[PDB]
């Protein structure tokens, strides 16, 4: 599923990402935009052999098992294909663990390089929330 901007802000808010560990909703929507273009089906291969899955591009190196990432962890204890559903629950619930692990949103390379330090509130402008 490809979400609209405000549609995803609302889903993220419902699942408790609004200011989760101090990251305003605009951060999360910005991260989604530049990670997946709001596409729950997005998958991308990393140079190390791991793959990033779903709307927040969660990596099989650490967070999920995709059957083909040797010597990796599965810290959200899920198959990586769970992160590709049209329901974002699994991605959100795993993102909560990732962002709580000491590195905050810096775990998302697109967030660091394209959202961090920017006027992220623009990402939720005009949405009924
Ligand atoms: Pt939902
Ligand atoms: Pt939830």
Curated annotation (Swiss-Prot):
Q: What does the protein in this record do?
A: Lysozymes have primarily a bacteriolytic function; those in tissues and body fluids are associated with the monocyte-macrophage system and enhance the activity of immunoagents. Has bacteriolytic activity against M.luteus.
**Disulphide bond pairs:** 6-127, 30-115, 64-80, 76-94
Q: How does it assemble?
A: Monomer.
Q: Which compartment or compartments is the protein found in?
A: Secreted
> Which residues act catalytically here?
35, 52
GO BP term (any one): cell wall macromolecule catabolic process
What is the organism of origin for this protein?
Gallus gallus
Name-wise, this protein is Lysozyme C
Give the misc comment: Lysozyme C is capable of both hydrolysis and transglycosylation; it also shows a slight esterase activity. It acts rapidly on both peptide-substituted and unsubstituted peptidoglycan, and slowly on chitin oligosaccharides.
Q: Name one GO molecular function term.
A: identical protein binding
- Is-annotated flag, keyword Signal? yes
Entry-linked PROSITE patterns: GLYCOSYL_HYDROL_F22_1, GLYCOSYL_HYDROL_F22_2
Q: What is the E.C. number? A: 3.2.1.17
Instruction: Please list the tissues where expression of this protein has been recorded.
Output: In the egg white and polymorphonuclear leukocytes.
Tell me the superkingdom of the source: Eukaryota
Task: Kindly give the Pfam families that the UniProt entry links to this protein.
Answer: Lys (PF00062)
In terms of SUPFAM superfamilies, this protein maps to:
Lysozyme-like
Per its UniProt entry, what is the enzyme's top EC class, as one word? Answer: hydrolase
Q: Which UniProt keywords apply?
A: Allergen, Antimicrobial, Bacteriolytic enzyme, Disulfide bond, Glycosidase, Hydrolase, Secreted, Signal
**InterPro entries, per database record:** Glyco_hydro_22 (IPR001916), Glyco_hydro_22_CS (IPR019799), Glyco_hydro_22_lys (IPR000974), Lysozyme-like_dom_sf (IPR023346)
Q: Taking every annotated instance into account, which residue ranges of this chain make up the domain C-type lysozyme?
A: 1-129
PANTHER family per the record? LYSOZYME C
Please give the family membership noted in the entry: Belongs to the glycosyl hydrolase 22 family.
Q: Which reactions is this enzyme annotated as catalysing? A: Hydrolysis of (1->4)-beta-linkages between N-acetylmuramic acid and N-acetyl-D-glucosamine residues in a peptidoglycan and between N-acetyl-D-glucosamine residues in chitodextrins
One term under GO cellular component: endoplasmic reticulum
Name the residues that bind substrate: 101
């Amino acid at each position: 599923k490809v979400f609209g901007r405000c549609e995803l802000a609302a889903a993220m808010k419902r699942h408790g990402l609004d200011n989760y560990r101090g990251y305003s909703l605009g951060n999360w929507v910005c991260a989604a935009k530049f990670e997946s273009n709001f596409n729950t089906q997005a998958t991308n291969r990393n140079t190390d052999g791991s793959t990033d899955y779903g709307i927040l591009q969660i990596n099989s190196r650490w967070w999920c098992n995709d059957g083909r990432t040797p010597g990796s962890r599965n810290l959200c204890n899920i198959p990586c294909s769970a992160l590709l559903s049209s329901d974002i629950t699994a991605s959100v619930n795993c993102a909560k663990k990732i962002v709580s692990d000491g590195n905050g949103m810096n775990a998302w390379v697109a967030w660091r390089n394209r959202c961090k330090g920017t006027d992220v509130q623009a990402w939720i402008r005009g949405c009924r929330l």
